[PDB]
Amino acid sequence: GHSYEKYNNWETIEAWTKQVTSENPDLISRTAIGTTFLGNNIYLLKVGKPGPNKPAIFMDCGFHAREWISHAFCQWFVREAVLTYGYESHMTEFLNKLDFYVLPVLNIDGYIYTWTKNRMWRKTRSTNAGTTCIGTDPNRNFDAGWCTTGASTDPCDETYCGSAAESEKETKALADFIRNNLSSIKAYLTIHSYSQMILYPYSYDYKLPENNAELNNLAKAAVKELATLYGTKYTYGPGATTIYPAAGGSDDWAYDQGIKYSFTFELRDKGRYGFILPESQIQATCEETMLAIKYVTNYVLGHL
Ligand SMILES: [Zn+2]
Ligand SMILES: [Zn+2]
Ligand SMILES: [Zn+2]
Ligand SMILES: [Zn+2]
Ligand SMILES: [Zn+2]
Incomplete structure (x- = not known):
């Protein structure tokens, strides 16, 4: 059983992508943009009412396996779109005028590995030459100051940059889709x-975007x-000076492709639960995050 207020395993999320698409054909279509190392289809939802020459916003979740609230948020966004379309003026305008590409995981x-073996797994599950250590950090695997700072050359490390930029099937698939669109x-x-x-x-160097x-x-x-919703306090700024320098991030790469509005969201909390944020916080986390995402969306729509 799928629920938006619980963490759902991959089998459940995958079935949900199919079901939410079938239930909402006028608003949602589904494609696969590639396959993972293990051969799992990487599903992408296109959310919006069909129309000519529509601009798009691309959102992904679940880069890092253990960050379960991320996966939950992509599902919540789609929940909100299908529930409030036609009823809420802003969401309806958003979906009429732009498309949202939502990549849930x-x-x-x-992600599967965090459900079956190790709740705290971060990286992919691909193999590495000359070691039995598994995985690459997908958010150190993009062609953006690749492997220079805040990224490790050791395949046994949590921030391992991979053998080359876009070495991972998953990051290559994402980068290919963005380049094609x-x-x-x-x-x-x-x-x-x-x-x-x-x-x-930027995160990959101490420099600022135009x-x-x-x-x-x-x-x-x-x-x-x-x-405004629950008083939750966020900080903001360029990555390098707001969190830490880190090379090979997808947001920096996307920006360097010419996508002028490129943001990373780091959701709740501030460390009390960390990655193991309780299910009881899914609703509040997702609802407040919706306000930020809709704010950015409205800004993009109004400054085309
Ligand atoms: Zn459901
Ligand atoms: Zn499957
Ligand atoms: Zn992360
Ligand atoms: Zn992070
Ligand atoms: Zn809501």
Whole structure:
């Protein structure tokens, strides 16, 4: 049984992607953008009412296997879209005028592993030459100052950058999709946990994006909007100085492709539960995060 207020295993999420699509044909279509190391289909939902020359926002969850609230949020976003379309003015305008690409779980193999073997697994489940240590950090595997800072060259490490940029089937699939759709995708949003932050480029070097003032102001306003619901306090800024320097991130890579609105969300909490955020917090976390995501979406729509 699927529930939006519990953490769902991969079999359940996969079945949900099929069911939510079948139940909402006028608003949702599903494709597979590739396969994981272990051969699992990487599903992508396109959410929106069909129309001509629509701009798009791309959102992914589940880069890091143990960050279960991330996976839960992508599902919640789709929940909100199908529930409130036609009833709530903003969501209806969003879905009429733009498409949302929602990738519910990128690192499917790692996610399965957190359910079956090791709740605290982070990386992919691919093999590495010359060692029995498993996995690459998908958010150190993109072609963005690749493997230079905040990333490890040791395959046994949690931030292992991989053998080469896009060495992982999952990151290659994501990068390929974005490159193939670069004329339509106007914003890139990537959902992580934890630490309550909205980050934007750059993480791979201490340098700032050309539109730094715009991104800073947008992140500041989105943080303020998020806080209105339950008073949850987020920080924001360029990745390198807000959390830490880290090379090979998808947000930096997306920005360097020309996607001007590129953000990483780090959801609840600030360390009390960390990655093992209780199910009792899914609803509140997702509802407040919705406010930030809708704020960014409205901004993108209004500044095309
Ligand atoms: Zn359900
Ligand atoms: Zn399957
Ligand atoms: Zn993460
Ligand atoms: Zn993180
Ligand atoms: Zn709601």
